């Protein structure tokens, strides 16, 4: 009656890990800290085909995309900092005073101007240098300074040429493997898509550091989406994507200069030396009235989950480093670290601008690593610099006595979620080309 | 609902030519093989040629192996029986069916389960 | 084979500040979290707040905010809980509780609890 | 190449079964350069092992192969218009995956192998 | 938060007799549910974890089952090891516990 | 093995014909090894890329494989002799190069997959 | 997959020529990667090597291929008791291995060139 | 009789820093399957 056939060709999937290549257009130059070992050039045709009368499960807090990426990034950062000069010989006893320019009240003591010897070109020789250093990046040797890597790890300069600016990158999957992309506009990232397709590479998703705020992300099409793997847990954090971005405007309004010093037979260390004009503290403003309506969204979609009449407050950060006590990010070349307790002063019952202070540092252990560290290089002028909140990463606080009252509070440090709120819509997937069925077809 | 009409029975000279249709209707032309059955008008029924749902094999029986050609067209719901050196034992009253066969994905349709009305052939 | 170690007890007084500390040895310390739970003599348990041993964020319950601040020391895998404006009712064991891997479950099924730190609080 | 790529996934098992072609063209294409060869050459081998398993069969070289293993009612008790014409390929996968081995097993147990010895005796006589 | 109501409050069964605890939630929790077991003058040991799962080196006669709102911890024999507090948790949220006896 | 290799590459098109398994049988076979195993994985995926396009075609396993596309005078309006017997096949890939991926869709459009689907249905009467 | 694997080896030839499934499904699977990846991409090749030389003869797909080549007493002249009966399969390669070039080179030669170009032409009348 | 490249299974239990095992072998095979040669006589030499 009926006989086994072989099909092959056959459109069925499982679930599946793999190594995803990266393409790029990587157009300019003629020194980016991804696209130049790694990746490979982007596609003419970006094609996407709609799997229509598919539904599939997608699972965005268990996407090996994520972790491929963390790994990826962590990478191409170590060998962008390969090739570079090693600062080892600054490890050494720094005499430091405040600086005698004008300062304001808010700046004192953020900066010191600090003398030390330093090698020459010539080993037999030395030279007497001075260098303005943030006093983020000083320890006091006794209760006379040191930088403050020195007990715990080695220093590496950036390269100054490569450039810190973001630039998209699109995550392809190689043959006999497809990624599914979720086009329902209303997903939080876990359950069944009904709307689904097949591209062969992510969108140009920007790897963008940064904690408490997700900036130049993608935006929600229809509403503020909140996605948490537990809603209900407290230890999970909260990727909140906007619907409408928040513009940031950032600066650094000291104009600065980039001394160069000699401290080896070709390599170069690239101080700050000294500020033209007055001294002013870096910072960040926001639209008070786009906060204000964009928190009100937030809210009313937290109310979703939290219940109708509680009352949802917004407090800055309980603790931990200043990467994540602070807004951390880096546009511009130089590290910047802004307060968001005026971002997150809010009580929202059931019924101009913000400045945002900004403390620069130039020793930065981006990925905590153990006996690893990078000095970031001065940047000659004033950096500003203009980006979209585009999400935020919460944390709810636990063990409330007051049933009444949700408080969240920003978090971050994982980037793994920042890149998480990016890669929540796609799911590699492992082509099955074989299938036997019966049919009424028989072999002679 | 099921409709399928003849069109083109005549009076034709001994070694001349003849093309009958057959127009369907009520049902999904495509999904169905189709096959021609003459009977002389005496006689009983005799199968005359056979062709699939896609239009790609025909079958034929002997005695009008290569006179005989069927074909179909899906898009307009047509199947054509070309008739070519028509002798005297071609005449006869000429019916279009839906069946004989049928894909290996379906179940088999050894059997002629919708009839034409028929089209009268005089040699 | 993973061991939780844990200060010694401490007898404070009315006003004063205890520095409990944890070292947890045989895992990858910023994988998990470290959680504080404190009980009181003859009580059930009560859940202080966690520290997340990666980046220090820290989670506190509400009534202890203000006056708990936990702390790490990656070098030395050591995670340290603060309590100040201590009370009488603070007299409990704390205890330093390690979740299993905190990347693929939940932070709050606790493998390993440690050993317990009584602190007493009298005048 | 990649144009309807997967696009019969949700049609039915018999209309997706005239797309083979498109699916079936899409499985053949520093530290990172390691990692792009690998991948490479496990897509060069996961497809050579499909194409082994075709041809131990009498299936070599072909995207629809009938063979002369009878259909078992322990392994689906459907009729031909449900599996071709009311469910898709992802659908009778996941019914008939438990069966999958007991099926590639008979392939190339008795079928192909006894008709191959058999093929080589006929060409004796 | 999340509240919860864990019954018997305080149980006595002699030895071969199943023991069953109750622990019931405030809402949907999944089965993010959680069962330790304290001896008196020691930490709380882990026996069931995610309200079904069996803790790797706890003898096989602990079990645990629920979902959603309700959970039920098993104990088929009373053998002498277990006598102890025994706790349910939801994340933040420890049980007020039942201590058996014998 | 590299004997002859390209050798028939000025002959005729028809004596060149003859030789194809010389120039067949040459297609398989620190940052340098790494390049030489790319140069390996390349050649490798390009051979089965090319058996895969003769297989989705009914010319698995050929050299020489005869199919069912007629012939289209606006490709080529040459008769037999001028092609087989006067020409070469580098010219005549240089001439048909602007018609060969319409040449290679009618291949695998509706000769092998409609054979392929009425050898299915042949296999039922 | 590994069970059998060459367990007829020492069974006389014609009881492992019933056994040629298991040994040809285990012909397809920092510097120590790099080590692996040879190792791989080695044996992708050397099987794409023998199945090019299946397939320039008539032997495409198959694991058992007749032929049209003679057999010449120069190379054995044992009857098929002794071969097939009596002796093994490395036997047989040890006593053949001086004239296997000869075989392969004359199923290339004519036999399937020859049949090929032969059914080229009676594709015509 | 041939050389070449063997790659290295273990089972790689325990740690949460081995000279060997991180960065040249792979996992370990659960089924070690042993497969005996019935009327299988062959020439061995571990000095070469
Ligand atoms: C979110 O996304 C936003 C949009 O991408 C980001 O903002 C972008 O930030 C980047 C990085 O700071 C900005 O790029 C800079 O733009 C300037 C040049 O662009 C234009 O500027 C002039 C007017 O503003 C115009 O006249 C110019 O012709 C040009 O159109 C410069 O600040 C800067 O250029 C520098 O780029 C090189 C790499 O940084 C640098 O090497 C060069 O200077 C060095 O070398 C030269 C030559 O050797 C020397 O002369 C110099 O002294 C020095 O040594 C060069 O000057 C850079 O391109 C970008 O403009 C900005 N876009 C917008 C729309 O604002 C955010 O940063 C993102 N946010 C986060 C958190 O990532
Ligand atoms: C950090 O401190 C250094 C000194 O360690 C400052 O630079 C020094 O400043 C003095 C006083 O301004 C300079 O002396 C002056 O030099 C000019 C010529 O450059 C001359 O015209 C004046 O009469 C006077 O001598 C000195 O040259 C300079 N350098 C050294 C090595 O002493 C530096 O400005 C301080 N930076 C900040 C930001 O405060
Ligand atoms: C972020 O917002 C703050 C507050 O509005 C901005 O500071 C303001 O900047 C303007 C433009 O530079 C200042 O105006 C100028 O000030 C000085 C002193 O009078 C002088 O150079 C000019 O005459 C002119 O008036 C303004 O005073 C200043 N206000 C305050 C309160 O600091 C800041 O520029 C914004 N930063 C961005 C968008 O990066
Ligand atoms: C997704 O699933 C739906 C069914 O839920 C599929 O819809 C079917 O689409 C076909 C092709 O367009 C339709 O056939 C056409 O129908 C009409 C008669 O109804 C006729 O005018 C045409 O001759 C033609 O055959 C069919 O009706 C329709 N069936 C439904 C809605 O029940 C759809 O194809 C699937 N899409 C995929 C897999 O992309
Ligand atoms: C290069 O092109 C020339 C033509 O320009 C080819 O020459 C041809 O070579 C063949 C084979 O040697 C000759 O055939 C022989 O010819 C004579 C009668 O002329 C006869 O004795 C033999 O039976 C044999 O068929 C042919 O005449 C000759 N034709 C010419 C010069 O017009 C040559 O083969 C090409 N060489 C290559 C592709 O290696
Ligand atoms: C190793 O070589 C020995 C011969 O030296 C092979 O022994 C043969 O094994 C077969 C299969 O078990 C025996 O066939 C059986 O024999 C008896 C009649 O004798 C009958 O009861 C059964 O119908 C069956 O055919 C055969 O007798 C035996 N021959 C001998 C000892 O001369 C053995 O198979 C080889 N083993 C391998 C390659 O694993
Ligand atoms: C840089 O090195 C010089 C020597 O080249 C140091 O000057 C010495 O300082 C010590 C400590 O105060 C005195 O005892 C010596 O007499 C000084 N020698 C000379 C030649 O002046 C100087 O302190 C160093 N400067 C730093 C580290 O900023
Ligand atoms: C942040 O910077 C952007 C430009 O990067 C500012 O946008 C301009 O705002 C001014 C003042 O209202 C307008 O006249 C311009 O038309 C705006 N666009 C541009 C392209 O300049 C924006 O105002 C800044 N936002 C702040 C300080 O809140
Ligand atoms: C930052 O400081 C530098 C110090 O030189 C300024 O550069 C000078 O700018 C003036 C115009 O104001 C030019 O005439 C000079 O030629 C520049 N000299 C240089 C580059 O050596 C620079 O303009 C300042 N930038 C600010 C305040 O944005
Ligand atoms: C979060 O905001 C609180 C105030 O609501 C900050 O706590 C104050 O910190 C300042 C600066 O150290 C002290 O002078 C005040 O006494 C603190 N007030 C209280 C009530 O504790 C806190 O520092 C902010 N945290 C962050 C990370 O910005
Ligand atoms: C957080 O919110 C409080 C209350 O809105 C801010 O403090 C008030 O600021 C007004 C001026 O706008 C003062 O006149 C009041 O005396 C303040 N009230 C209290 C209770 O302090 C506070 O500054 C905010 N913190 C930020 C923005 O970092
Ligand atoms: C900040 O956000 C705005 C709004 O999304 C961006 O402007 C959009 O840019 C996209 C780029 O594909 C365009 O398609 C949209 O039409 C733009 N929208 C508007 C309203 O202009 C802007 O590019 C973002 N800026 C940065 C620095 O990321
Ligand atoms: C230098 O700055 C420090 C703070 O870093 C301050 O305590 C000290 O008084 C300042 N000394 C001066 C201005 O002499
Ligand atoms: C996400 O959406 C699914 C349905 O698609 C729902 O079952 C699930 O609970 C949602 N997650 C949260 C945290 O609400
Ligand atoms: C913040 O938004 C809420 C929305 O209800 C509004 O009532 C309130 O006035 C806003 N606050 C400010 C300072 O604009
Ligand atoms: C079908 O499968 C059953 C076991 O499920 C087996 O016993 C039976 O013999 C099989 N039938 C055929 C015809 O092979
Ligand atoms: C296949 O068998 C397994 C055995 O554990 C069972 O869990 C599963 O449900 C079965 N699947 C089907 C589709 O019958
Ligand atoms: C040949 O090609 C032309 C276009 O160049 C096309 O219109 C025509 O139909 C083709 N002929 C055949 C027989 O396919
Ligand atoms: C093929 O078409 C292109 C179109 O630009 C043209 O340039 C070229 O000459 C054509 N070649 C032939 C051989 O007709
Ligand atoms: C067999 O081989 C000999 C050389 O050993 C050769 O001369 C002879 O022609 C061959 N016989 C056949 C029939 O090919
Ligand atoms: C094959 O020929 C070589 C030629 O040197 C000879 O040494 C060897 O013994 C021959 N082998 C056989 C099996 O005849």
Redesign the pocket.
Known sequence: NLWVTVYYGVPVWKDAETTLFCASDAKAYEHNVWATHACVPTDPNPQEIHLENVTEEFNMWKNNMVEQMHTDIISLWDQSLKPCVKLTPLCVTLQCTNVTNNITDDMRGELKNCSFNMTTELRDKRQKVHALFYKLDIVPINESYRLINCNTAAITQACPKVSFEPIPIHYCAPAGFAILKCKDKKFNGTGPCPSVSTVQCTHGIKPVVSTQLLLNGSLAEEEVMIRSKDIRNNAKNILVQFNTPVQINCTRPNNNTRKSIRIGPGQWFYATGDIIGDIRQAHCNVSKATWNETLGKVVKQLRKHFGNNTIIRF??????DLEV??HSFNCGGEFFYC???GLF?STWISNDSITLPCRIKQIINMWQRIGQAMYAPPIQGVIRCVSNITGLILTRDGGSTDSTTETFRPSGGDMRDNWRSELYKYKVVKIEPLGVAPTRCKRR | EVQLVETGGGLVQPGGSLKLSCRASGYTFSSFAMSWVRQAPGKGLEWVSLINDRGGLTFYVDSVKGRFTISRDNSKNTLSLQMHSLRDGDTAVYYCATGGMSSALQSSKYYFDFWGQGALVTV | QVQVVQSGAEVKKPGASVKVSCKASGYTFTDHYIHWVRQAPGQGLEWMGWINPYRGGTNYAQKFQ?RVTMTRDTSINTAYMELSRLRFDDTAVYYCARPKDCSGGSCYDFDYWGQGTLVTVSS | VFLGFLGAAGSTMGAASMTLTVQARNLLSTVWGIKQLQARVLAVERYLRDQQLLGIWGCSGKLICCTNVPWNSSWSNRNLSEIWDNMTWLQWDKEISNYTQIIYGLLEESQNQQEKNEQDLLALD | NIQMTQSPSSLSASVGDRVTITCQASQDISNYLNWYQQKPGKAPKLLIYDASNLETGVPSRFSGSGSGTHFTFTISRLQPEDIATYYCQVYETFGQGTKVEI
């Open positions: 407090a800055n950060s309980s603790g931990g006590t602070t307060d968001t307790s002063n | 203000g």
